[PDB]
Amino acid sequence: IRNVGELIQNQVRTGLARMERVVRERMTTQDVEAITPQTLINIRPVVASIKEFFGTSQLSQFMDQNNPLSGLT
DNA sequence: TGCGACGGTCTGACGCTCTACACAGTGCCAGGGGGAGATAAACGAACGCTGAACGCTCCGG
């Protein structure tokens, strides 16, 4: 079973791989002595991957609150 | 040519509502052509003013 931690970890890994591709493309077209850690990395893929996981996914489900038993189940 | 078999191709895979949701990482400005809106004038029209003018009942000396 992929629990909640492993699923969110996989989504963060996909976002970070996209970020690594973006930063590779950035450093292939950038000069040295003008690179700052605040600049060459972009957090947009990570947040986009997380938000695309928590919504419109078959795993992150709208919790049913009919009764406590349904919540636990 | 006959042979299997190898492979691609192609199809659907009972029914409805109660429910039912939305969608994400990389340039920049100058010169030039059109039409939207404000402007002040214009040719023509009819819109008013001029009371005048025709005709009526009229109270009348």
Side-chain angles (χ1 to χ4, degrees):
Chain A
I1 62 169
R2 286 170 170 165
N3 60 7
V4 64
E6 183 166 355
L7 289 157
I8 305 180
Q9 155 162 297
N10 293 356
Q11 297 312 300
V12 168
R13 187 195 328 277
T14 290
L16 280 176
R18 295 174 184 175
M19 187 212 59
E20 212 68 1
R21 207 264 308 278
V22 164
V23 71
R24 210 161 290 269
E25 161 66 35
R26 190 147 312 189
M27 65 184 73
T28 48
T29 52
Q30 201 59 228
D31 64 312
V32 291
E33 294 182 0
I35 297 169
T36 304
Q38 268 313 97
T39 61
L40 77 164
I41 68 174
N42 195 17
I43 72 181
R44 179 67 66 192
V46 168
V47 186
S49 174
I50 289 172
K51 194 188 307 304
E52 202 203 358
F53 168 63
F54 279 106
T56 76
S57 178
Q58 213 164 10
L59 266 297
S60 164
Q61 296 166 352
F62 198 45
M63 182 179 72
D64 43 352
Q65 321 196 40
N66 281 309
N67 63 7
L69 193 60
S70 174
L72 273 179
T73 309

